[PDB]
Amino acid sequence: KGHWIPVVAGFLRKDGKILVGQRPEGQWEFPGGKIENGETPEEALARELNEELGIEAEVGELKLACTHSYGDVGILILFYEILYWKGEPRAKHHMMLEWIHPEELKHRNIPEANRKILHKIYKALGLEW
């Protein structure tokens, strides 16, 4: 077997908080989405943040990559830091957007793929857990 879906996700950081979106009916995920053939990962992410949030984001440092399996398919998530953007994030894809202290992730319903690597996420934000 050998099937894979590459995904980009943004860590939008502001005032010590991180932006998280509630999946449509709800788990809380980092905004972003799938990489389309022909796009760089940074292009994909700028596009998805524009599509989901309506912002024009500067894609910053590549922080982390993780793999997870959904049985028949492999998922590869690339996590990029976003420190600068134009526009305000609006919930045009998610039922709810929320700024949270990274600490809250420990007690929010996030995808099990994100929960299993939460230690890596905090390290990737330069935080201790």
Q: Would you list which residues are annotated within the binding site for GTP? A: 23, 30, 32, 34, 114
Q: Return the structure tokens found at 81.
A: 């830091």
In the bound complex, what is the minimum distance in angstroms from residue 35's beta carbon to its own copies? 6
Give the helix/strand (H/E) hosting 72: none
CB atoms within 10 A of CB 120: 15
Closest to Ho ion by CB, 33 or 102:
33
**Shortest gap between Cβ of 67 and its own copies (angstroms)?**
6
- Residue with smaller CB distance to Cl ion, 60 or 113: 113
Q: What is the biggest distance separating any 2 CA atoms in the chain, rounded to whole angstroms?
A: 44
Q: Which residues bind Ho ion (CB under 5 A)?
A: 33, 48, 51
Please state the closest distance from residue 20 (CB atom) to Cl ion, in A. Answer: 8
30 part of the interface to Cl ion, by CB under 5 A? yes
Nearest to 59 by CA among 36, 78, 37, 76: 78
Q: Which does 51 bind (CB under 5 to 8 A by kind): Ho ion, Cl ion, its own copies, none?
A: Ho ion
Under a CB-based contact definition with an 8 Å cutoff, are residues 119 and 129 in contact?
A: yes
